[PDB]
């Protein structure tokens, strides 16, 4: 029987996988996406600066390193598989069941599902290459940059509609294209509908992202009606791609085992990655504890803690923490080649 099943292949699940391997635990890693990376697959061309010890470079580049790390010890990896239920048969005996009916057994379970299912939108860029785009946004925090700008927002989820309203306060115009399979959320919509500089475009998708010359920005967007198929090209200064996150619609609402939940539908972490059920640990954006940050850095330190607690759960007399890698015997064979051949 596998030592631990890890649900979620984002940076938190990946590091948890690595550190569980560092602690000599057999690992099963499950993720619904066709590739590992979680939310990081949303913003591949973006330059990341705030990961500890990592000089700024594209997210997809850092992701490649993070994935490699998660797979050093070669865990049992299951992609394109969606967990729907978690069960505790007994102590050191858990069942993890997918929507396809597959049932996986483990002595422990690590939940690293972030905010739920990630399904990145496939953007088709013409004229420019995506890796050099500047006016393409996947999240809105500061919106002062959008002053007097013609802004496009894709997605009609509550968060996207909130962004639209805030941006509308100073933007020249805001256009929201979406499909109404998006929530869309009555209150967020009611607020937005009286922003008279906002155009709502239901049943509409982004077909093409177009930029001229060489340029490093999108200058115009080809929009397409989902039903009629009619297209028209509109110029924008900024394009914002929302994804629609709802932490309240994960499996944790309808599994066969209910962890205590934070009021925002995050798993209640008891000081750390410990949950209300012994043997189950939550790491990353899904868990709440006082030391949390919404950062990849925090996802990593959570992963370590989840692996440690899972290790001591399976084997109580084991060390509380893992051996530091600098003096860990498992890396020595590789270290000599790395040093001798200067593989860094």
Ligand X SMILES: Cc1cc2nc3c(=O)[nH]c(=O)nc-3n(C[C@H](O)[C@H](O)[C@H](O)COP(=O)(O)OP(=O)(O)OC[C@H]3O[C@@H](n4cnc5c(N)ncnc54)[C@H](O)[C@@H]3O)c2cc1C
Residues between 91 and 150 with contacts to a second copy, criterion CB under 8 A: 131-132, 134, 137-142, 145
- Chain positions 15 to 44 lying near ligand X, rule: CB under 6 A, are 30-33, 38-40, 42-43
**Partner in contact with 116, chosen from a second copy, ligand X, none, beta carbon below 5 to 8 Å by kind:** ligand X
How far apart, in whole angstroms, are the C-alpha atoms of residue 224 and residue 191? 26
Helix axes 296-314, 11-22, angle to 10 degrees: 40
For ligand X, the closer of residues 198 and 251 by Cβ is 251
Torsion (CA) 104, 39, 269, 87 in degrees, nearest 10:
-20
**Running DSSP on this structure, what letter comes out for residue 131?**
G
Q: Does 322 bind a second copy (CB under 8 A)?
A: yes
Q: Which residue has tokens 């049932």?
A: 103
CB closer to ligand X out of 127 and 331: 331
Q: Which of 22, 27, 48, 218 binds ligand X (CB under 6 A)?
A: 48
What residues from 74 to 93 belong to the interface with ligand X (CB under 6 A)?
82-83
**SS3 for 39?**
helix
State the residue number with the nearest CB to ligand X.
284
Using CB under 6 A as the binding rule, the residues of this chain from 107 to 126 that contact ligand X are: 112-118
What's the closest the beta carbon of residue 187 comes to a second copy, in angstroms? 23
Residue 319, both tokens: 């060390």
| Contact characters 235-274, a second copy, x per CB under 8 A | ----------------------------------xxxxxx
Looking up tokens 């593989």, which residue turns up?
343
CB of 144 to a second copy, least distance (A): 8
Q: Where does the chain have alpha helices with state H? A: 11-22, 59-70, 158-168, 186-192, 296-314, 332-340
Candidates 3, 4, 5, 13; binder of ligand X (CB under 6 A) is: 13
Whether 250 and 265 have beta carbons less than 8 Å apart is answered as yes
Residue 43 assigned to a binding site: yes
Structure tokens at 31: 């993720």
Annotated binding site: 12, 31, 39, 43, 83, 118, 285, 326
């Amino acid at each position: 029987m596998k030592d631990v099943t890890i649900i979620g292949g984002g940076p938190s699940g990946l590091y948890a996988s690595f550190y569980a391997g560092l602690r000599d635990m057999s690992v099963r890693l499950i993720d619904v996406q066709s590739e590992l990376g979680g939310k990081m697959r949303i913003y591949p061309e973006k330059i990341i600066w705030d990961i500890g010890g990592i000089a700024p470079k594209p997210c997809h580049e850092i992701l490649k390193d993070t994935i490699k790390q998660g797979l050093y010890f070669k865990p049992e990896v299951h992609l394109n598989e969606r967990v729907v239920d978690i069960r505790k048969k007994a102590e050191r005996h858990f069942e993890v069941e997918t929507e396809a009916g597959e049932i996986y057994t483990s002595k422990a379970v690590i939940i690293a599902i972030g905010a739920g299912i990630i399904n990145p939108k496939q953007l088709d860029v013409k004229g420019v290459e995506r890796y050099q785009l500047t006016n393409l946004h996947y999240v809105v925090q500061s919106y002062r940059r959008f002053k007097d700008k013609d802004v496009l927002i894709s997605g009609g989820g509550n968060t996207a509609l909130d962004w639209a309203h805030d941006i509308a306060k100073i933007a020249k115009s805001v256009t929201v294209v979406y499909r109404k399979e998006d929530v869309s959320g009555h209150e967020a919509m009611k607020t937005l509908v009286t922003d008279l500089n906002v155009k709502l475009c239901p049943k509409t998708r982004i077909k093409y992202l177009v930029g001229n010359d060489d340029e490093t920005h999108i200058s115009e967007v080809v929009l397409e009606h989902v039903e009629s198929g009619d297209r028209h090209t509109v110029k924008f200064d900024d394009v914002i791609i929302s994804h629609g996150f709802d932490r309240c619609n994960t499996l944790l609402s309808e599994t066969s085992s209910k962890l205590d939940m934070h009021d925002d539908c995050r798993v209640k972490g008891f000081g750390n990655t410990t949950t209300s059920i012994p043997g189950i640990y939550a790491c990353g954006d899904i868990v709440y504890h006082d030391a949390k940050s919404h950062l990849i850095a925090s996802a990593f330190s959570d992963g370590a803690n989840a692996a440690n607690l899972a290790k001591t759960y399976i084997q109580p007399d084991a060390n509380a923490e893992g051996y530091v890698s600098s003096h860990h015997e498992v890396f020595k064979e590789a270290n000599k080649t790395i040093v001798n051949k200067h593989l860094y």
